[PDB]
Amino acid sequence: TKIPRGNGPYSVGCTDLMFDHTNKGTFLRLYYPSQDNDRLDTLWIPNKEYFWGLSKFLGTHWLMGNILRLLFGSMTTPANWNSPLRPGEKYPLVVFSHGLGAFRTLYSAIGIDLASHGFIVAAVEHRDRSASATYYFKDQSAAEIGDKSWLYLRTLKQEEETHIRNEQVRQRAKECSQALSLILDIDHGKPVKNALDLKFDMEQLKDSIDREKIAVIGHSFGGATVIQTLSEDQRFRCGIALDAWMFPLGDEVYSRIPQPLFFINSEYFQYPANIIKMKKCYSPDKERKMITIRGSVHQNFADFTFATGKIIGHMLKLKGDIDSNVAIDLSNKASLAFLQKHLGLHKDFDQWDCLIEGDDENLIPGTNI
Numbered sequence: 020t021k022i023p024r025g026n027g028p029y030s031v032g033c034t035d036l037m038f039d040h041t042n043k044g045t046f047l048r049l050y051y052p053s054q055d056n057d058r059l060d061t062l063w064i065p066n067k068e069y070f071w072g073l074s075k076f077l078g079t080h081w082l083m084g085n086i087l088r089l090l091f092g093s094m095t096t097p098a099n100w101n102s103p104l105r106p107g108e109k110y111p112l113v114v115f116s117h118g119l120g121a122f123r124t125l126y127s128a129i130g131i132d133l134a135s136h137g138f139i140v141a142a143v144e145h146r147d148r149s150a151s152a153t154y155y156f157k158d159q160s161a162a163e164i165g166d167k168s169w170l171y172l173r174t175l176k177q178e179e180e181t182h183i184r185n186e187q188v189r190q191r192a193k194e195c196s197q198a199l200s201l202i203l204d205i206d207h208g209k210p211v212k213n214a215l216d217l218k219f220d221m222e223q224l225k226d227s228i229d230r231e232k233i234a235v236i237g238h239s240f241g242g243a244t245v246i247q248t249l250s251e252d253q254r255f256r257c258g259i260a261l262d263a264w265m266f267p268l269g270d271e272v273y274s275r276i277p278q279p280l281f282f283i284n285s286e287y288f289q290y291p292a293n294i295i296k297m298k299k300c301y302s303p304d305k306e307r308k309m310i311t312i313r314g315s316v317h318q319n320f321a322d323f324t325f326a327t328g329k330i331i332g333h334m335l336k337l338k339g340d341i342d343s344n345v346a347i348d349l350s351n352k353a354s355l356a357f358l359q360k361h362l363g364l365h366k367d368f369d370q371w372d373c374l375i376e377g378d379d380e381n382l383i384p385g386t387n388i
């Protein structure tokens with residue numbers, strides 16, 4: 020696997036939590052500082068249906084699903100699966116929202132680095148039919164059996180795109196909020212039976228959250244999810260939008276976001292009509308920051324940027340001109356500086372305060388647009 024280990028001093032564990040078991044319940048992947056660093060064995064894409072899901076998203080035949088599955092079906096990402104949570108400290112919490120065509124496990128590079136710097140991360144799987152695929156259970160006994168019910172991406176007609184994308188970003192914000200509630204409630208002793216039978220005991224999460232230091236982060240569609248979630252839920256104290264796709268937002272959200280907001284853009288994805296929505300969020304009484312990662316493409320924020328070689332990567336637009344490790348470090352470090360400054364963290368992340376300003380050879384302050 021070429022998915023980067025986290026650059027931070029904590030060891031990183033991973034597990035999955037679904038609660039309740041239904042289609043309206045919460046599904047998320049957890050990355051967290053783990054007690055021991057025994058084995059980086061987490062299955063990156065853990066079900067065949069996601070490869071089928073991806074193929075349907077990409078426009079590909081029925082065979083490409085099996086091809087992708089053959090290429091990546093056993094690839095790991097460097098986190099200790101179900102490793103005990105590192106005790107003795109409350110950690111700041113991040114809720115992460117995946118982009119269109121993605122699902123909870125495709126942003127592990129981002130998540131693992133955050134976790135290795137002291138964060139618990141909850142990457143939610145959206146059930147708005149924006150994920151290539153996702154599942155839930157029809158009743159308790161199905162959950163007990165692992166008898167899954169799969170939900171696949173919804174292709175939209177042009178007539179639909181305005182209404183349905185806005186309905187989806189609303190649902191998405193509600194799922195970020197629901198997920199946050201699940202964690203906060205586990206943090207304060209709510210007994211939960213995970214709908215997945217995993218070794219990780221959710222009891223460990225009791226009193227492990229620093230409840231004042233919460234952020235929502237999100238890529239593309241997830242970028243828009245960030246802005247919508249902020250406007251609804253003041254439990255999120257800041258937001259970080261990775262190359263947001265602003266189209267889903269109604270004009271009412273811009274006036275309603277008090278919390279700090281950080282836009283991190285790829286150089287090659289942005290276009291004026293999208294950027295102008297980002298500038299709408301700007302007000303003298305608010306903190307908004309924007310940097311552009313030089314020579315990066317849209318997919319630089321997702322794990323598939325580390326899934327192929329240089330040439331194939333460029334061909335598929337999984338990779339930009341910039342090295343994918345240099346990109347995602349600049350994005351993780353800028354973020355860490357932003358999270359420290361606005362969550363009030365007592366760590367050394369402010370050593371990358373310059374990166375919030377785009378003060379790097381590989382950063383454009385603001386936007387080229």
Ligand SMILES: Cn1c(N2CCS(=O)(=O)CC2)cc(OCc2cc(F)c(Oc3ccc(Cl)c(C(F)(F)F)c3)c(F)c2)nc1=O
Nearest residue numbers: 073087118119120121125238239240241264321322323335
């Ligand atoms: C709104 N949006 C996106 N777009 C809006 C601008 S557009 O030009 O009109 C269309 C794209 C892309 C995206 O990407 C998230 C994402 C999707 C995937 F399918 C991913 O997985 C991929 C992505 C690409 C590829 Cl080629 C493959 C592979 F199977 F072929 F390897 C897998 C992924 F990592 C992230 N998430 C988004 O939310």
